[PDB]
Design a binder for this molecule. Structure first.
Ligand SMILES: C#CCCCCCCCCCCCC(=O)SCCNC(=O)CCNC(=O)[C@H](O)C(C)(C)COP(=O)(O)OP(=O)(O)OC[C@H]1O[C@@H](n2cnc3c(N)ncnc32)[C@H](O)[C@@H]1OP(=O)(O)O
Ligand SMILES: [Cl-]
Ligand SMILES: [Cl-]
Ligand SMILES: [Mg+2]
Length: 384
């Protein structure tokens, strides 16, 4: 029935727009007319502005998400974004502290809800629009189905609109009105025995343990020999190589040089970017971020260490060769599995590089924007 969503400027479930339509649902917005009062919470609850740069505030967000954030459809894994990852994800160029919004239960002073956004220029069907990218919506497990999520969404919408920003981008596994694109995850096992043991992968009479280990074995030699960790000197180069690649897609972030430094410069256990420099030019790049899952009630392993593909571009090798190198670099950094969405060129390598299809998919959404939807190979943005 979507009783909340059908109040909002998003498409109905059966809306179909053709390529001649690429504009807002609601235009001519004025900051002057945005509500200046905070949305009302149920009695006993209060808004709290989180300071993500403060270690203690950040640890409170970390705890809320560790305990209550997204699980796989089978409730076997729960994402466990690290505190240093959250610091990176939320303090991008020009971020607003006041879009990092928490809800405390007053009687215990405990954070029980959170939602966040950061600002970025998004190009959709060649039109570039300032958007908020919304993420980390989370309601404590003990307070589910009480309609707190619409309150957090309406309050962040209000605060984003105060900055004269009227569109947003967000992804989710749940189906909501209405995806602009839909992309499955695929996974490439690295630490095969651990993935078996925790119930992530399986074996059969044809695929014995030893045969599975051999199937997923990787040669410890790079196809692109000079791939090395990115440094500050490489920011102009990555800005040109990635910037030029992305222009072909129907949906992508238009990164400034400051944004390139922020999103790609390596941070241990958070973001890994490797470059190939030839003649003072950056000609290939690989990048992947760290997102572990807590393995729910497992005796042996508490954590699945997963690398998620971010942005990969080659001009000196094949895409296959580049992605075989990304799996190698993730292996050299202790990751158990390399995951990727069927966006950009990724699906073209999945068969040959022995990826498995994951369950369900990730839906891409715009708020207050009507346009044609498209196949996920035309998506050129990866959100965290
Ligand atoms: C400018 C501008 C606009 C700015 C705003 C743009 C819109 C942004 C939307 C939010 C985007 C979120 C992106 C993500 O971060 S992804 C990960 C979501 N994090 C989890 O998966 C963690 C585990 N899970 C939870 O923590 C809770 O289940 C949630 C997700 C907070 C939902 O809370 P609960 O207690 O279930 O549900 P209640 O409070 O009764 O709310 C029901 C209404 O809510 C809608 N809803 C549910 N999940 C949603 C969701 N994931 N995103 C958006 N809406 C969602 C839903 O359909 C329904 O509304 P209807 O009646 O159907 O029209
Ligand atoms: Cl009022
Ligand atoms: Cl090597
Ligand atoms: Mg609720």
């Amino acid at each position: 029935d979507y009783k909340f969503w059908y109040t909002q400027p998003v498409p109905k479930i059966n809306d179909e727009f053709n390529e001649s339509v690429n504009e807002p649902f609601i235009s001519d917005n004025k900051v002057e007319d945005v509500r200046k009062d905070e949305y009302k919470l149920p009695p006993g609850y209060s808004w709290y502005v989180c300071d993500v740069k403060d270690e203690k505030d950040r640890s409170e967000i970390y705890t809320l998400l560790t305990d209550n954030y997204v699980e796989d459809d089978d409730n076997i894994f729960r994402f466990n974004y690290s505190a240093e990852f959250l610091l990176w994800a939320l303090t991008s160029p020009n971020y607003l502290k006041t879009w990092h919004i928490g809800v405390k239960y007053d009687a215990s002073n405990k954070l029980i809800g959170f939602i966040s956004a950061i600002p970025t220029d998004i190009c959709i069907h060649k039109r570039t629009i300032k958007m908020a990218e919304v993420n980390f919506l989370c309601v404590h497990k003990t307070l589910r189905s009480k309609r707190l999520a619409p309150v957090l969404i309406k309050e962040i919408t209000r605060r984003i609109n105060l900055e004269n920003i009227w569109q947003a981008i967000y992804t989710a596994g749940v189906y909501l009105p209405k995806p602009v694109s839909d992309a499955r995850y695929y996974h490439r096992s690295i630490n095969v025995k651990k993935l078996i043991e925790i119930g992530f992968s399986s074996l059969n009479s044809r695929l014995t343990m030893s045969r599975a280990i051999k199937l997923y074995r990787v040669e410890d030699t790079l196809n692109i020999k000079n791939m090395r960790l990115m440094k500050k000197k490489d920011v102009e180069g990555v800005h040109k190589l990635l910037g030029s690649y992305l222009e072909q897609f129907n949906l992508y972030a238009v990164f400034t040089k400051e944004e390139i430094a922020h999103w790609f410069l390596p941070i241990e256990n958070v973001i890994y970017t490797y470059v190939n420099e030839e003649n003072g030019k950056i000609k290939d790049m690989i990048s992947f971020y760290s997102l572990p899952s807590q393995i729910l009630g497992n005796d042996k392993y508490s954590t699945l260490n997963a690398a998620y593909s971010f942005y990969n571009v080659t001009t000196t090798a094949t895409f296959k060769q580049l992605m075989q190198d990304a799996i190698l670099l993730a292996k050299r950094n202790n990751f158990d599995v390399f995951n990727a969405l069927e966006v950009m060129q990724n699906k073209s390598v999945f068969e040959d590089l022995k990826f498995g299809e994951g369950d369900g998919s990730l839906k891409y959404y715009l708020y207050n924007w009507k346009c044609a939807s498209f196949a996920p190979a035309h998506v050129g943005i990866v959100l965290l």
